[PDB]
Amino acid sequence: RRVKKNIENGVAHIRSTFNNTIVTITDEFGNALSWSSAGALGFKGSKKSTPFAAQMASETASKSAMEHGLKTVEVTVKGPGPGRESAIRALQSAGLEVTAIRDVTPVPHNGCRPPKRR
Amino acid sequence: AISQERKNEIIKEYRVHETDTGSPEVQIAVLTAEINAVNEHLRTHKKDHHSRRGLLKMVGRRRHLLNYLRSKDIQRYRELIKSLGIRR
Amino acid sequence: MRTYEVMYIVRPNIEEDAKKALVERFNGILATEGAEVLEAKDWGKRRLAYEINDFKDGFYNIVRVKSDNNKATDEFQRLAKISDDIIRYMVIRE
Amino acid sequence: GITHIDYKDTELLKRFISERGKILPRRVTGTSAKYQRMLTTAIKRSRHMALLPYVKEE
Amino acid sequence: MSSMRAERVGEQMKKELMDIINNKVKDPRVGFITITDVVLTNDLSQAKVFLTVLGNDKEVENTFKALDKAKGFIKSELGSRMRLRIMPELMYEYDQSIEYGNKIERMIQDLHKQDR
RNA sequence: CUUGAGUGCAGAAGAGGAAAGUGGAAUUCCAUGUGUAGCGGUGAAAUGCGCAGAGAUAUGGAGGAACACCAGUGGCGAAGGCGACUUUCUGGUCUGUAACUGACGCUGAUGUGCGAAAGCGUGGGGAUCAAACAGGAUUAGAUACCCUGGUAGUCCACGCCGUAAACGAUGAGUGCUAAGUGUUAGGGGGUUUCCCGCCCCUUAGUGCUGCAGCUAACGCAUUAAGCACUCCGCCUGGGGAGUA
Fold first, then answer.
1. Fewer CB within 10 Å, N or C, chain A?
2. Residue C64 DSSP code
3. Are C40 and C62 spatial neighbours (Cβ–Cβ below 8 Å)?
4. Which residues is chain D interrupted after (C–N above 2.5 Å)?
5. List of chains touching D (3+ CB pairs within 8 A)
6. Cβ-Cβ contacts under 8 Å for D28 (sequence gap 6 or more)
7. In which domain, by residue range, is E17 found?
8. What are the residue ranges spanned by the domains of chain D?
9. How far is the CA of B50 from the C1' of F92 (A)?
10. How far is the CA of B35 from the C1' of F159 (A)?
11. Nearest residue (Cα to C1') for F114?
12. Which residues pair with C8 in a beta bridge?
């Protein structure tokens, strides 16, 4: 049933770097069925970082998400992304039932030294 | 580093009169005890330079007190120097 | 003469008999070298704030002992390391 | 006037903790620097026993 | 009034600025999950920061009245981070393009309505 | 003789030091589940990886490094420096009392130690980062800034090296000379039933503002760059030259 998994409660994994945005939709335990990225849909370079690219990637990810059926979903925020602040309204306007919003910023407890230069 | 009880017994048995707590003999004795303790620690822990600096300060204090004793009264210095077996 | 409060966590998977054997053996090996237990208490089932390795919970219990400076840690630092039935422990002072 | 903070009394260690499980700064709680040092020592010791979380949001 | 160098300074200043504003500005009770975009003059003495906030027209004002106080900390840390010689003065302004662009999408309805 | 110095007695705080053990986050990598055509990068690109299943997500594992919050114009140390927790060993400082020794003190050439980072030798380890090096980008040109990798090194043990804008650019010791206001560790008194509050007095640090005074000015000002005494180190125009 992997392809046509019928579940209305998963988790929404967005990822928005300062150059690109990757959006994927998984199950509650975290089983990916579909994803969308600015690089997949003709966005190159700067236009990938622009927020509306992230919003449209979220729309095209949600389309495939409810293709197999999905109603409620929780959003996880990874990294600093210029498209994340409107992403929640994008998914909720796409016909979703977003329940919990959680920002997961991986902050190292001084494990490895950051790159010196940019 | 010498436990308070050992300190008290050292000043008990190196005292000069029953009320005396600080005097060249008592101070030199307790300093020798502390010096031996820190020397044992440095024997076990070699690369401990701050403790060695403290030990050098203790050695200097003991040597200055010993010089003061030898200048002040020679006989008690002569009997003290062999009680602990130092200053060959 | 220093009091060494020590608490340790045993996994919930153990049987009751094995749990009691563990507790009595650990108190005995703690106090057998010269330490004398002043208070051995079984705090009991209490929810952890994190999964240790894969266990959700454990048994808190406290042993308070006074001895010299190397009667509490000496056997723990070996036996608790090899013994996988223990998963967490530490010893504090006064 | 508690004058001694013990890491097994989790009520006081939850009264002075954040919703993230982080230690609240002295300005927020308004305690003293000495008791602040005792509190962070106790909180770290409790965290070592899985008695308090490292990062909690759920 | 713009050079590639100003663009690189803007990008690398945006990356650090977003980090500091959301990971080090504790004291202002009104912290907000913000997005940002920064532009500068050719001489790097003036820099404009454009950002978005979530809330009402009293929460954006509270957050602004908090950013106004925090500007000192931001400038200090930013100078402590980047190699740039002269700290540009910083003023924070809403990215009106967000609402204007949204209004820009609005008349799309009118074109589709009359042709249907 | 007790005032300086020191030992006591009762207390206090501390990332002071050395050794062993323990823990969480994060990191890279490996394995597994889902899953398809992209990932990361920049100003834009490009180099590179990706159909052999990448990136993303979830779980498990391996190893190394450093300890997010606390965190402070805070603390400790002679300096360099020292922040996860526990234990062991150990140095220094401060407060109050002060019966105890009774000037036992200060400075300190030669001497002997410690001494950031880099670097050298023998080994071990190596996750991130990254001189050199390879490629791409940029440029009139770019050997550089930017990107993709990456060796020595960064880490550990024992030695060597002994230098820094090693800085308070202010040597150490002592005494005197207006104030105001924070802050760390104590002590005492008063008020309040009670200090958990507050106020007053005080010792030792650590800040800011300011008299007299000093300075060429900037500025310093009880943490003096003021008023004095003791001892040590050093200077006598710039370049040549830290050269022969």
1. N
2. E
3. yes
4. none
5. C
6. none
7. 10-94
8. 1-57
9. 9
10. 28
11. B49
12. C61, C89
